Amino acid sequence: LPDLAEQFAPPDIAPPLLIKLVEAIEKKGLECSTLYRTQSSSNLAELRQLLDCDTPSVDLEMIDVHVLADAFKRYLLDLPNPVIPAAVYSEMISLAPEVQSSEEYIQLLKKLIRSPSIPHQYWLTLQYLLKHFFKLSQTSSKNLLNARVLSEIFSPMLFRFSAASSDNTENLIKVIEILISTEW
C-alpha cells in the first residue's frame, strides 16, 4: 500500500480506506464475540484486491464481517512503515532504562511518534485506531474485547515486533492497552 503519509494529509483525520474499513466493521461487528480472533476463508490477493485502490474493491458494507476483520489486519501488515515507525520503536527500547514510571513510558511514545521527522499522519492514524479499540471495549460484555485483549492482538502489528524481548514486548503491550483505556 502507499505510505500512510501518502494516503491522506491533515485536515483529514485518518486514511480514507481505514475509515471505510473501521465504519463497516463497527456497523456489523460491535457485538461479535469472535471479531479479530478468527480467520476468514479469504487468502491475501482476495484480501489485497479489496485493499481499495483504483479497482476491484466492492462496497465494504456487502462484505462478511470476518473478511473485513482480516482485511483490517492485512492493511496494518502491508503498510510500508508500521503505524509506530521502526525508529520510534527502536528509541523506546533503548530509552527504556532511562524511564522511571509507566506513565513516562506512555508519554515518551507520544513525544517520539510526534517527532518533527515523523509525518503527522502516523500519530493521527494511531489516534483513530485507539478510538476504534476504545469503542469496541465499551461493548466488551458482548464482544469480549477489553483493552488488554485488543492490545495483545494489535500491538505486534502496530509496532511490527520483529524480535522483541518478552519484557520489552510486555511493556509495549501495556503502553497501548493503557492508551486505549484513556480514550474515555
**How many domains does the chain divide into?**
1
CA–CA gap between residue 128 and residue 57 (Å, rounded): 22
Cell 513516562 belongs to residue: 104
Experimental technique: X-ray
- Are 67 and 142 within 8 A, CB to CB? no
Residue 162, number of CB atoms within 10 A of its CB: 8
Cα–Cα distances in Å, from 62 out to 2, 32, 104, 172, 173? 25, 17, 44, 36, 33
- Are 130 and 180 within 8 A, CB to CB? yes
Q: What is the CATH number of the domain that holds 9?
A: 1.10.555.10
Decide: helix, strand or coil at residue 168: helix
- The resolution, in angstroms to one decimal, equals 2.0
Decide: helix, strand or coil at residue 152: helix
Cα–Cα distances in Å, from 170 out to 22, 47, 53, 161? 26, 30, 36, 11
> Domain range spanning residue 115?
1-184
CA–CA gap between residue 63 and residue 65 (Å, rounded): 6
